[PDB]
Design a protein around this ligand. Structure first.
Ligand SMILES: *[C@@H]1O[C@H](CO)[C@@H](O)[C@H](O)[C@H]1NC(C)=O
Ligand SMILES: *[C@@H]1O[C@H](CO)[C@@H](O)[C@H](O)[C@H]1NC(C)=O
Ligand code: NA
Ligand code: NA
Ligand code: NA
Lengths: 269, 269
């Protein structure tokens, strides 16, 4: 029921997110073309997409990802990588909230996600803002899978309202904060959040509701199976804060579902 | 190009081969229903399929796999796993040939694959023949991916001509021996060998021709990409021993192509 155009953008930023794991970018200098192993990001590769800045283990939270310039789609893309060990990351996630009044009043955010972003926020804002000054008609997009989707969502909330819109596309993202933060991410001006979940993926059900967490609205829930191709009629737009009957269902969730967002993600063949 | 029936069998044996890696078969008792993690084998789970025998690190060559009864498809399936570390195996694979005149005259086979089979041949033959003597109507199929596909091929060549057809479905198998063995596999009565390859998969390119190896004919070559769903029209039948222009083409090969045969294989989400 989503337009072909939105389905194509969902595909594209799933592959920018996938490229944060699989991108041939160990020491890739600025200006190198973005390429991946294992057909992880073919639509990225078709674009005129280059690395503006790569980072690995940055700040106190050891944040990894890259800033890209895409002259085909006219994008400035900040892509954050999830964990290198997702099963261990999932099973060892702490659920502590901290106040984040400097992002929204009465908002509380995951201590790790919000500390990791704060630690790199000055450096990454300046990189993004340099790119925007150079290409003021390009669209700014923040994206990521898993922990990277959390970091993208926190980053977006914090850097919006500085005269360029920031759209956020997250894939399998955990809850990032309390109901006031979910409410803020629902309504915040200056950019859209496209929060994409898949079947019974455990990560978007963590941290739990009973640790004081809430999801933002809306959710774009992929109903097609693990290792199954996604069609346009497989995505369901579900409205409402902590809406049930997309990913937030009372059934038993799984980790393989987290690794399949329009193709393989969070793991590299 | 192939029939819809054969396309469905291709997909089904790809999942029996995947099950050798992702099956919940760890000291699993006989009679247990076959299930996989990570949606590896949904067609196998749909079927009334159970374990007749599991084996792990069997013989000198540490051969791993299972014998399955399938009362829906009327099958007896002997599925061999490939390596637990395929990249390590590819890198460390030696090319030594050894006399197999007891299989066919003037045939030479890979030392490791033939020795690994020979070590387990008596026990597994007994298992197969117990299933045949209980279900004489059922189709005997040997299958496997990677090293498992080579073991299924050698096992087939050895055990045919004892009163039951043995069909072999191999996925990304390496060459198994010399031109004589290749010709024997092309023409051997008592079953069909379906040797399936995918795009530029590295493993069917090993050992190299230059070490005295040939492929059997024909080859079913999948020309759809890594992480792309396979259509019936995406399989080409390629005739001739050491035919070029399926997998045997002069381009750079890669490992991810090995792990995508109708779906994920050789790794478990
Ligand atoms: C880098 O991508 C650009 C734009 O797509 C292309 O013109 C150039 O050939 C690419 N570089 C290499 C080394 O392929
Ligand atoms: C085993 O599979 C059969 C049908 O294929 C079914 O009757 C039975 O419930 C299954 N066993 C379990 C433990 O689910
Ligand atoms: Na490119
Ligand atoms: Na908005
Ligand atoms: Na079953």
């Amino acid at each position: 029921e989503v337009s072909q155009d939105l389905f194509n953008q969902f595909n594209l930023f799933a592959q920018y997110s996938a490229a944060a794991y699989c991108g041939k970018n160990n020491d890739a200098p600025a200006g190198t073309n973005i390429t991946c192993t294992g057909n992880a990001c073919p639509e990225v590769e078709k674009a005129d997409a280059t690395f503006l800045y790569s980072f690995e283990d940055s700040g106190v939270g050891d944040v990894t990802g890259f800033l890209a310039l895409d002259n085909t789609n006219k994008l400035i893309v900040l892509s954050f990588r999830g964990s290198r060990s997702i099963e261990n990351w999932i099973g060892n996630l702490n659920f502590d909230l901290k106040e984040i009044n400097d992002i929204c009043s009465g908002c509380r955010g995951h201590d790790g996600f919000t500390s990791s972003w704060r630690s790199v926020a000055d450096t990454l804002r300046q990189k993004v803002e340099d790119a925007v000054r150079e290409h003021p008609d390009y669209r700014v997009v923040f994206t990521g899978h898993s922990l990277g989707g959390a970091l993208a969502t926190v980053a977006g909330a914090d850097l919006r309202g500085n005269g360029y819109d920031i759209d956020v596309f997250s894939y399998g993202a955990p809850r990032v904060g309390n109901r006031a933060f979910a409410e803020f991410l629902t309504v915040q001006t200056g950019g859209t959040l496209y929060r994409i979940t898949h079947t019974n993926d455990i990560v978007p059900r963590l941290p739990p509701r009973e640790f004081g967490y809430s999801h933002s609205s809306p959710e774009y829930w992929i109903k097609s199976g693990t290792l199954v191709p996604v069609t346009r009629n497989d995505i369901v737009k579900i409205e409402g804060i902590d809406a049930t009957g997309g990913n937030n269902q009372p059934n038993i969730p799984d980790i393989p579902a987290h690794l399949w967002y329009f193709g393989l993600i969070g793991t590299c063949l």
